[PDB]
Design a protein around this nucleic acid. Structure first.
Lengths: 124, 129
DNA sequence: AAGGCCACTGGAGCCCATCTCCGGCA
DNA sequence: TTGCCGGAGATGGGCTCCAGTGGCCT
């Protein structure tokens, strides 16, 4: 994609480190953000966020994009899984599920799937 | 500028339609203005001066009001639409005709984009000029 | 049965085009 | 004193990402 200043951009992706770098630099040299923006062909909004994060952080590294937070893999639930396995190291994945239900730790909706629960064991 | 009857009858250059064509985007102020300009039903608040791609905001407040609607921005108004146009200045899209309030002009090559001339379009809208 | 494989998600961050508040200048 | 110009943090749109999750297979 091409912005209205004439710049080349990739919708969704961070501005290249080499450029974020230049942005900070020019600002350091005393160039006004509106000029940098108009010059380096970058939306003043963007120049703004970058400069601001740098002044507030010291980095030119953009935030971490993507991922998600746990849904079923609740903190407590993750522990219960450790407790059950610790008690009986060979209890099956589906048996842990029934125990989580039997002790009301999870609903018929909260309850983590077998795959997930074995995934919890593996990764913890 | 299109083969299929990519949807009919009313405005000559529907912004919703031009977006799909000219690059892309969630409707840009200038595109909004082109649309309203190619809609006979709107000729009382905004219209072509007759001189090339230049136009006038017969009723800036009415133009503004509408813009707000399009963008779902109830707080819009001339003040902000104006600075919006003022923003287009160094992007060589819109320029203000000195010595006249409410009159502006598209300076990008609309002929290449639209596939029409000023006069061509003008005729189709029945431009008093 | 636990691990390999995995389509599918949603919410996060990203730049962009304003929106918005306001100082400058005439 | 009205009239226009322009700087820059705030917005939310469409987009790319990806941890996370839950089937399916073996």
């Amino acid at each position: 994609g091409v912005n209205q200043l004439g710049g080349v951009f990739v919708n969704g992706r961070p501005l290249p480190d080499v450029v974020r770098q230049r942005i900070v630099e020019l600002a350091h040299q005393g160039v006004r953000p509106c000029d940098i923006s108009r010059q380096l062909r970058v939306s003043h909004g963007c120049v703004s966020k970058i400069l601001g994060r740098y002044y507030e952080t010291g980095s030119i590294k953009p935030g971490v994009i993507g991922g998600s937070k746990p849904k079923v893999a609740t903190p407590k639930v993750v522990e219960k899984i450790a407790e059950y396995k610790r008690q009986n190291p060979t209890m099956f994945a589906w048996e842990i599920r029934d125990r989580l239900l039997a002790e009301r730790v999870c609903d018929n909706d909260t309850v983590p799937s077998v795959s997930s629960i074995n995934r919890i064991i593996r990764t913890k | 500028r299109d083969r299929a009857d990519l949807n009919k009858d009313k405005p000559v250059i529907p912004a919703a339609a031009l977006a799909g064509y000219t690059g892309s985007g969630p409707i840009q102020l200038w595109q909004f203005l082109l649309e309203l300009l190619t809609d006979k039903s709107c000729q009382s608040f905004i219209s072509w001066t007759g001189d090339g791609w230049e136009f006038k905001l017969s009723d800036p407040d009415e133009v503004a009001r509408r813009w707000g609607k399009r963008k779902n921005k109830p707080k819009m108004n001339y003040e902000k639409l104006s600075r919006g146009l003022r923003y287009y200045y160094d992007k060589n899209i819109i320029h203000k005709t000195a010595g006249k309030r409410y009159v502006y002009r598209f300076v990008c090559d609309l002929q290449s984009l639209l596939g029409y001339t000023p006069e061509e379009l003008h005729a189709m809208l029945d431009v008093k000029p």
